[PDB]
Write a protein that binds this ligand. Structure first.
Ligand code: IF9
Ligand code: IF9
Ligand code: IF9
Ligand code: IF9
Ligand code: IF9
Ligand code: IF9
Lengths: 152, 152, 152, 152, 152, 152
């Protein structure tokens, strides 16, 4: 059903370096979304080139890959109603210049090349990103104790 | 005066159950509004039918009444300049899908049937709600120590 | 059972005036205690004299009663295992000079005659205080959604 | 270049009196802006009349000057990419009625004559305000340890 | 040398269920410890029996294993000077009855069988726990941008 | 009188670099202390050698002076009953290893040579430090709006 939608959220190396992991996770927990999966890694160049395969011809691509490999990331899957679209609202606009106060990027960063976090742009993108970053058995099935107070 | 306006705010059963009472009251205190009245109760079905009398023919009404009776609520009166309209802004849109990050519903909930909080929609509705939920003697008259730093 | 113990907590007029209501309630919610009752009132002199009957001959008593009547208080009942003794630890020592950082008094106040909050000193005192400050029907029976995650 | 832009931010006497200094500074730190200068003073009437010279014929001006002299302010300079315009977004609208939740004014104040904070409206105004409020040697040159994680 | 010490911290199923993951991580980040490894899983009964092999004859053991399997945990490795001993101080006493306000257990839980978090008790135990819970390649080597401001 | 006591608090260059200025100031404001003076500067080597004159023969002294000059500090004066001794409690032990959770050093740092903050050790030392670091005219006389709710 619609309440079982999932999105991929990654905290980028700048978000880890600037000590924002706990703050970001809290935002998702407090909203009522369910954490499905989480790991911490330095993504290989090859892995990142696959993640960003659509951008391989963009002028910023070599620098993007180097930056995304320049420290570890936190990779996550979150579940809930409209979590892809709502996750993007919670992150704010991709360019922090346009991100509103109250959003993750609006509160915590400045420049588009150092924009702390990624969220899937669509359900189709989410499922592709989840398959790339996680093994199926890393996605945990459990029920939140407050589920019936979050959902009708 | 305009600064003597009051609104009725109720934290719904899901807000209590999910441990948001303190967080919500803090939002109103830190803004500069004055807490006038507060009580904690399980509202009866008869009481809720009166509260929601305008909705009695809406298809969601029986379920709404049952949910609103399914645990305790925190009922409050807050005072301040434009507190009705500003209170509604602070809560966010009634549908959490449309509530912006930074608002109570935007930060803390997902689905319209579990939308954690109520605020009066108008001054007229506020006075009706205050009369329904509170005895006149339960509204306390005192002056905030910071009043002259909040108002010219 | 031991998990059904209750205590009386009151936020004193200075706690209300200094905008600490939300912060204090959040401390109790986040610990895993269940809010049973809550109301907001200006306690009469006669009421306060009964609450402080043991102190009626102490030199500070007239001033104590006047201060406790000088604005509204938030009166509450909280439930949980050892909530009386643990509640006192959470508040800190009655004299804020001796209250450790991390406690309510340690974090938020300075002087013993303006010590923001009261908690029952014993189960026997709690049951007396609960009877004095609340009508039986103001104590709400409900079960926390996270109860099985707070208690074995 | 663009990352070296500076703005003038002043916490007004109401923001000091209401205990918001730390909360406001934290908002600027967490965003990634660099604190360049800071001091705490009661601004003289003459000083304030110069700061507000463009408003000298507005009907609210005498009251504005009196209020701005009625307690100390925190005067600050912050540096970063688009810090003038982004600083203004973070503050919210000058009139708190229109300031969104998540912004400093939206979260913490109510009325235009008690609007807790000032930010420069333009780079040209910022440089004028910085010269008026600060001696050149009070602007400290240092590099943030996280600079390369905030800026590409 | 001493600054390279590591500990194993696990957020127990109750900590996940009660929405404390972000809050706990933030405590470690803000202190200056470096996150080395993190994953999210439901630990098997066999895995838990190995982790708790020293407790296998304690009367609470069967229930402990069931509870530790009853939802996912967040498993982490953290690095820094005296992180084992300091980590334990930050968590508080293993029995929440004795955990002081300001500690993780003191702030957020009540009963020993639902005590939200684990930390290694010694360096020897930490290295054993890290080997049990993590593959060597899951421990990420990077340098914190603030390392020279945390350590001389 | 006793409520007019003052102490000197400095946030050291590590506390500024790690983004803790807001957090530290908030701890003092929320306690009920009055901010008297504040400025931001890079203290000269000569100034620091005077501040630390008692330590001039200790083996760590050259490094201490270089670190304390290696970025800006926030220097402050705070007023209130027992503010020197209570300030020290709020900071925690000078050695962060021994600082309890809930204190500034306990929550936010690790090693003695990077211990984020200084507070005067005695009233005599406070008055000496205030004279060294501030001009008399930088200490602002104003009355907190909540004074009568903090003090009897
Ligand atoms: C920030 C990004 F990682 C985006 O996520 C992703 C695709 O952006 P797009 O397809 S335009 O839209 P989204 O759905 O992800 O917003 O490329 C990055 N990116 C975009 N523009 C720039 C730029 O000028 N400089 C640098 N350094 N990185 C940029
Ligand atoms: C959440 C509510 F309590 C509203 O606040 C209130 C008035 O709704 P409306 O007539 S749109 O007026 P405003 O609240 O915008 O002033 O009825 C509830 N409500 C509205 N739509 C729905 C729905 O689809 N399902 C369920 N379960 N409850 C709903
Ligand atoms: C603050 C208090 F309300 C205490 O909670 C309560 C019970 O006294 P006691 O049995 S010593 O306290 P606990 O061990 O239960 O905390 O009396 C008040 N109190 C105590 N000493 C003083 C004082 O010098 N001046 C003023 N103004 N109030 C005082
Ligand atoms: C709050 C302010 F300090 C404004 O920032 C500044 C410039 O006003 P404006 O020309 S509308 O420009 P922006 O702030 O949009 O740049 O005057 C103050 N101000 C504006 N309207 C009022 C008022 O009715 N009463 C009082 N007491 N102060 C007012
Ligand atoms: C909470 C624990 F996980 C301890 O960490 C661990 C080792 O306990 P111990 O030998 S006292 O060692 P430390 O905690 O001092 O390291 O056993 C658990 N535990 C202890 N007592 C009890 C109990 O009565 N019921 C339940 N359910 N779990 C208990
Ligand atoms: C951290 C300090 F600035 C102390 O505040 C101050 C006064 O020392 P003491 O008189 S023993 O402490 P308090 O009176 O302030 O409690 O010397 C510094 N200090 C002490 N031990 C060490 C050390 O091993 N390495 C380095 N790098 N700095 C140290």
């Amino acid at each position: 059903g619609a309440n079982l939608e999932r999105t991929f959220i990654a905290i980028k190396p700048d978000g880890v370096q600037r000590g924002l992991v706990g703050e970001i996770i809290k935002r998702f927990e407090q909203k009522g979304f369910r954490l499905v999966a989480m790991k911490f890694l330095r993504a290989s160049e090859e892995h990142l080139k696959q993640h960003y395969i659509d951008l391989k011809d963009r002028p910023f691509f070599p620098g993007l890959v180097k930056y995304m490999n320049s420290g570890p990331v936190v990779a996550m899957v979150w579940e809930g109603l409209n979590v892809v679209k709502t996750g993007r609202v919670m992150l704010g606009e991709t360019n922090p210049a346009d991100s509103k106060p109250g959003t993750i990027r609006g509160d915590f960063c400045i420049q588009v090349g150092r924009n702390i976090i990624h969220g899937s742009d669509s359900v189709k993108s989410a499922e592709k990103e989840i398959s790339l970053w996680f093994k199926p058995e890393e996605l945990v099935d459990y029920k939140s104790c407050a589920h019936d107070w979050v959902y009708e």
